[PDB]
Amino acid sequence: VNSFSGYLKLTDNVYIKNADIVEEAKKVKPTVVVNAANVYLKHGGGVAGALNKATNNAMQVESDDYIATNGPLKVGGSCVLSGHNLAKHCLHVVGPNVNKGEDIQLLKSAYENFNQHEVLLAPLLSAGIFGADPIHSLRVCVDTVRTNVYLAVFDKNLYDKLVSSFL
Numbered sequence: 001v002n003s004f005s006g007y008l009k010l011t012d013n014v015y016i017k018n019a020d021i022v023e024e025a026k027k028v029k030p031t032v033v034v035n036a037a038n039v040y041l042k043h044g045g046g047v048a049g050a051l052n053k054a055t056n057n058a059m060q061v062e063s064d065d066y067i068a069t070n071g072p073l074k075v076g077g078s079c080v081l082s083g084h085n086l087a088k089h090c091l092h093v094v095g096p097n098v099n100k101g102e103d104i105q106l107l108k109s110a111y112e113n114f115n116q117h118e119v120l121l122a123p124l125l126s127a128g129i130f131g132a133d134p135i136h137s138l139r140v141c142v143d144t145v146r147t148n149v150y151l152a153v154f155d156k157n158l159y160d161k162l163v164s165s166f167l
């Protein structure tokens with residue numbers, strides 16, 4: 001039993017809710033919140049900008065030190081950093097950004113990072129400003145993640161479309 005509330009069950013291990021991931025993180029304080037990161041961990045907009053703003057820029061400060069030491073992530077890769085006031089840990093995962101021309105096949109690799117964590121609160125990777133089709137992202141999630149994932153979808157209209165079209 002866990003504290004996630006109001007989710008629709010899609011499969012054995014995937015759950016979905018119309019929610020603001022920032023507000024959901026603030027209330028649940030999950031072990032892991034996933035950030036929709038880029039390779040430079042520059043948290044300017046989308047989910048990343050919102051999560052970072054909620055940490056009063058502490059996520060960005062920590063991220064800049066990470067990059068200065070380790071260099072950029074790979075598209076499809078991830079790193080574990082602090083969850084600050086939102087979660088125990090933040091798993092920064094880089095899905096391909098279609099608006100930069102990155103290969104969508106890397107979306108499966110991106111979701112594979114979730115399998116290293118038993119339970120996660122997450123957005124749909126490569127959705128929103130990353131330019132991928134969220135219906136495809138949900139399909140890849142369901143067919144790749146085997147651990148327990150709670151997906152927060154900010155847009156109510158999109159949420160209803162994802163549920164109604166789910167196979």
Ligand SMILES: O=S1(=O)CC(CNc2ncnc3[nH]ccc23)C1
Nearest residue numbers: 020021046047050123152153154
């Ligand atoms: O005030 S807001 O419209 C800003 C938004 C931030 N929270 C999100 N939650 C889940 N997926 C998301 N994708 C992009 C943002 C987002 C609530």
